[PDB]
Amino acid sequence: GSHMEDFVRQCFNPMIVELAEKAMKEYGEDPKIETNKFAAICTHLEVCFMYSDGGSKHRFEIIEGRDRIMAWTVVNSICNTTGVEKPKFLPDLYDYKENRFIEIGVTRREVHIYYLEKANKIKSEKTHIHIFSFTGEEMATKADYTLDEESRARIKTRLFTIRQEMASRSLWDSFRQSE
Ligand SMILES: O=C1c2c(O)c(=O)ccn2N([C@@H]2c3ccccc3SCc3c2ccc(F)c3F)[C@@H]2COCCN12
Ligand SMILES: [Mn+2]
Ligand SMILES: [Mn+2]
């Protein structure tokens, strides 16, 4: 048992920890060994849920936090009913108001370089990209940040609090140096 596994369980709420475990077992990874990945999946889930909380009610379809098959099922219903092209890789949300999928990224590095890697990867110019960093930076496709800024600020504050919490336990260095 890691310091990291225990920290994750006292830092994140039980719903999120549970969903992260579901996700790792969907891909055959073990939360007890891949413990930095565990912390990151938890962090990304919380950010995604905080993000969907920022819109008006009914604004977002949440695709993250579902098992692989149901996630693609919801993407299919979105595509077959809005006419949007079906992405090749699973996004995180769908914006009913702007009518585009969103890929949310959380990075230990500089937002620029993770954004490039995502934009490279998806190869689908239709999926809007929004990166957050553990230093309070963000980067969104076409400089369009989707949410108004109080909702993005909460995410950035929470990310930095996780960073401090990890650091107070000397977990932070090992966490950064695993991307
Ligand atoms: O949806 C995601 C995903 C993202 O949306 C993302 O932004 C980064 C990374 N992702 N992935 C996450 C994930 C999410 C957040 C932080 C780290 C990881 S690391 C890979 C991994 C994921 C989930 C379970 C697992 F066992 C993994 F090894 C996989 C990529 O295949 C599509 C689904 N998924
Ligand atoms: Mn995802
Ligand atoms: Mn994501």
Side-chain angles (χ1 to χ4, degrees), residues 44 48 63-65 90-93 102-104 118:
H44 179 262
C48 279
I63 292 145
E64 177 70 38
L90 263 188
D92 285 313
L93 306 165
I102 308 173
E103 177 56 33
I104 279 161
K118 301 281 225 166

Side-chain angles (χ1 to χ4, degrees), residues 20 23-29 37 40-42 44-45 64 90-92 103-106 114 118:
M24 292 182 73
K25 293 179 173 68
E26 285 271 312
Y27 295 83
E29 307 260 357
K37 197 167 289 183
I41 287 166
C42 282
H44 179 262
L45 270 172
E64 177 70 38
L90 263 188
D92 285 313
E103 177 56 33
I104 279 161
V106 182
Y114 195 39
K118 301 281 225 166

Side-chain angles (χ1 to χ4, degrees), residues 43-56:
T43 298
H44 179 262
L45 270 172
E46 184 164 6
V47 169
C48 279
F49 291 158
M50 286 173 86
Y51 203 96
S52 63
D53 197 32
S56 69

Side-chain angles (χ1 to χ4, degrees), residues 20-84 86-122 124 127-146:
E21 295 174 331
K22 296 289 190 65
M24 292 182 73
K25 293 179 173 68
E26 285 271 312
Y27 295 83
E29 307 260 357
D30 190 356
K32 308 220 201 272
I33 303 110
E34 295 277 23
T35 65
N36 290 318
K37 197 167 289 183
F38 189 26
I41 287 166
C42 282
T43 298
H44 179 262
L45 270 172
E46 184 164 6
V47 169
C48 279
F49 291 158
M50 286 173 86
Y51 203 96
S52 63
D53 197 32
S56 69
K57 74 177 182 177
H58 299 177
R59 178 164 178 178
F60 295 113
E61 203 62 72
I62 308 179
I63 292 145
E64 177 70 38
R66 306 183 183 265
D67 56 66
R68 284 166 73 188
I69 306 90
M70 188 66 33
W72 279 111
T73 303
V74 174
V75 163
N76 276 3
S77 306
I78 284 159
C79 294
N80 285 108
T81 54
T82 69
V84 169
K86 167 164 172 294
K88 302 292 281 184
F89 307 97
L90 263 188
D92 285 313
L93 306 165
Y94 182 81
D95 183 343
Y96 279 117
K97 175 187 202 191
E98 298 287 352
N99 273 311
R100 62 204 177 198
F101 293 96
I102 308 173
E103 177 56 33
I104 279 161
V106 182
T107 191
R108 279 72 47 77
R109 281 172 297 150
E110 213 176 87
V111 298
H112 322 269
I113 183 173
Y114 195 39
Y115 182 112
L116 290 175
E117 296 171 0
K118 301 281 225 166
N120 177 15
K121 170 50 161 318
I122 74 176
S124 171
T127 296
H128 201 77
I129 299 177
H130 199 140
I131 311 305
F132 299 85
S133 84
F134 286 87
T135 47
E137 295 145 81
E138 63 180 329
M139 187 169 142
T141 301
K142 278 184 271 142
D144 179 357
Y145 290 98
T146 294

